[PDB]
Design a protein around this ligand. Structure first.
Ligand code: HEM
Ligand code: 9LR
Length: 137
């Protein structure tokens, strides 16, 4: 289920974080506008870059903590508020988070593995709802 999926992802988090984030940027090329320094790069070029591996892994370190603190795929309001307030997210709207979770769910569906993709899709929906509620447009 969802909790085991957190353990699976954490067991190889650098790899999953890069692969899911690349799935997100390739599915929604226009999202490269928030990361201007990733433009005109192949996947292998991005994985060679410092900011890419470090930043993507830090995103997923926190995403897994938010997942782990959730009840029935419903995140804490405090985790939602942190995500909205962060200076690094000043630009963003719920659509940015929408798209990241569509890509994550698709990645899980396509994987060889028994991910609980339905639980991640509900988690994404519930996080978008919590971000809206905490003041993201
Ligand atoms: C649950 C989802 C997400 C989590 C947990 C999360 C978490 C984080 C964390 C921890 C950082 C700081 C990392 C660092 O400075 O090394 C960060 C920065 C950032 N995040 Fe997010 N993030 C999420 C979703 C998004 C989405 C959907 C976008 C854009 C579409 C985004 C854009 C950014 C940007 C642009 C930065 C700063 C740019 C940079 O790294 O130089 N994040 N996020
Ligand atoms: C905070 C952050 C850092 C790195 C990212 C990558 C896509 C490498 C985006 C999110």
């Amino acid at each position: 289920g969802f909790k085991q999926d957190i353990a699976t992802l954490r067991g190889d988090l650098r790899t999953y974080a890069q692969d899911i984030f690349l799935a997100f940027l390739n599915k929604y090329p226009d999202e490269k506008r928030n990361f201007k320094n990733y433009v005109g790069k192949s996947d292998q070029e991005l994985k060679s870059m410092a900011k890419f591996g470090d930043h993507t892994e830090k995103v997923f370190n926190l995403m897994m903590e938010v997942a782990d603190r959730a009840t029935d795929c419903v995140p804490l309001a405090s985790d939602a508020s942190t995500l909205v307030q962060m200076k690094q997210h000043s630009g963003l709207t719920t659509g940015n988070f929408e798209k990241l979770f569509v890509a994550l769910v698709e990645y899980m569906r396509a994987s060889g593995q028994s991910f609980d993709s339905q639980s991640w899709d509900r988690f994404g929906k519930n996080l978008v709802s919590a971000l809206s509620s905490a003041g993201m447009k």
